[model samples]
Target: MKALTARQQEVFDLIRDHISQTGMPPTRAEIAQRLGFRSPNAAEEHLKALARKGVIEIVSGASRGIRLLQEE
Candidate 1:
């Protein structure tokens, strides 16, 4: 798997925490708000990067779309 940047790791940790606490992944808006991002699209971009890195998957047009891959 590709390695994460520090900020990407931060976002990943938040997503993981949200899932562990609520049994669901965070929305883009929620991620943006929590991470103090200027726009939800910023969160979306990071999420896309995470997906590209094989850390997470995103289901288009779905709430709670983020899914983390299991460690090998």
Candidate 2:
């Protein structure tokens, strides 16, 4: 897996926590709100970065489709 930057790590951790509590990944808007992004677009970009890093997967044809590729 590719190394994550500090902000990426923060995003990653948020995803993990969301799943832990809700048994589902957060939506882009949720992430944006939590992270104080101006819009969900910022959350989407971070999610794409995580996917590229091999730490997460975005499921096709699914909403809130984040899947963690690594545990811990």
Model 2, runs deviating above 4 Å? none
Q: What do the candidate models score in CA lDDT, each in turn?
A: 0.80, 0.83
- Estimate the lDDT of model 1: 0.80
Instruction: Give candidate 1's error at residue 20 in angstroms.
Output: 1.4
Model 2 / residue 51 / CA error / Å: 0.7
Tell me the TM-score of each prediction against the true structure.
Answer: 0.84, 0.86
Worst 10 residues of 1 by lDDT: 63-72
Candidate 1 wrongly placed segments (more than 4 Å): 70-72
lDDT of 2 at 26: 83
Alpha-carbon lDDT of model 2: 0.83
**TM-score of candidate 1 relative to the true fold:** 0.84
